[PDB]
């Protein structure tokens, strides 16, 4: 199926406490593979997945030049945007940037992305045409004119349609053993009386990869979506994910309810009953 690669950058001002905190992370699909931390010793882009470890110094040197240049650009931008918004020097603010590309099962480019935030809200974004920008507010309009004059979109598009997809294909091949696996969920049910007349049924999915999954409850074959408590899909810490779904049922009627689990790893959707 399809795959993604994304870079996420966070810069946070800390007035009177030195230079802003800068953190970079890179992912392929749901697997993190690199990091940079302005506050760490090494001052290099570092590996965080085993399959990237094999890249040589020519890679790590260019990646370090890149993340350093991003961190310096973002540090100056924190000053600029404080100015655009007429904010005092005393408060802490945050720039976030995401960019990356999606590829289809044939490895071909599907979509590219570049979007930036200020204090957790949209600031400026590259449109799907990879040619024009959408500015969230008047500050971002100032940035937009600047970026239109510097032909910023053409540079981003060049990366998104080229290097981004090329290296995504390289990683999918070199980390094939983990990136291209499907680990189907391991499923079970739990059951807890709440009173004499109600009980909880909880349907578990564990140990699955990728993160995308669907868990649904039915009663006599009918969807119970609005009566289902879900938790957000969460990391197990070993590179797999977890989720559960629960319903409250009349004691004695458990057998009318079925849990349905759909995942890429499964030959067939699973059905569970108590």
């Amino acid at each position: 199926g399809s795959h993604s690669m994304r870079y996420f950058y966070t810069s946070v001002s800390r007035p009177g406490r030195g230079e802003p905190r800068f953190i970079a992370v890179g992912y392929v699909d749901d697997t993190q593979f690199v990091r940079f931390d302005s506050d760490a010793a090494s001052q290099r882009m570092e590996p965080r997945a085993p399959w990237i470890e094999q890249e040589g110094p020519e890679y790590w040197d260019q990646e370090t030049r890149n993340v350093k240049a991003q961190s310096q650009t973002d540090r100056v931008d924190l000053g600029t945007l404080r100015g655009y918004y007429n904010q005092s020097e005393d408060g802490s603010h945050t720039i976030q940037i995401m960019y990356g590309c999606d590829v289809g099962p044939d490895g071909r480019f599907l979509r590219g992305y570049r979007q930036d935030a200020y204090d957790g809200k949209d600031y400026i974004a590259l449109n799907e045409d990879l040619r024009s920008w959408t500015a969230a507010d008047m500050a971002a309009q100032i940035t937009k004119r600047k970026w239109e004059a510097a032909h910023a979109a053409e540079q981003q598009r060049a990366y998104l349609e080229g290097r981004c997809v090329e290296w995504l294909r390289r990683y999918l091949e070199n980390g094939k053993e983990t990136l291209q696996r499907t680990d189907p969920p391991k499923t079970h049910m739990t059951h807890h009386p709440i009173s004499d007349h109600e009980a909880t049924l909880r349907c578990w999915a564990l140990g699955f990869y990728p993160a995308e999954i669907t868990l649904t409850w039915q009663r006599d074959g009918e969807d119970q979506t609005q009566d289902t408590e879900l938790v957000e899909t969460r990391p197990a810490g070993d590179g797999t994910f977890q989720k559960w779904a629960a319903v409250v049922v009349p004691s004695g009627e458990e057998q009318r309810y079925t849990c349905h689990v759909q995942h890429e790893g499964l030959p067939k959707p699973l059905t569970l009953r108590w």
């Binding site: 870079y7 970079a24 890179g26 882009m45 890679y59 260019q62 990646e63 030049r65 890149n66 993340v67 240049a69 991003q70 310096q72 650009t73 973002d74 100056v76 931008d77 600029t80 945007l81 960019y99 570049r114 930036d116 600031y123 400026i124 100032i142 940035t143 600047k146 970026w147 510097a150 910023a152 540079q155 981003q156 060049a158 990366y159 290097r163 981004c164 090329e166 290296w167």
Partner: peptide, 10 residues
Amino acid sequence: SSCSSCPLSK
């Protein structure tokens, strides 16, 4: 791989 030319001042 990340982008070498993309950063431009806001």
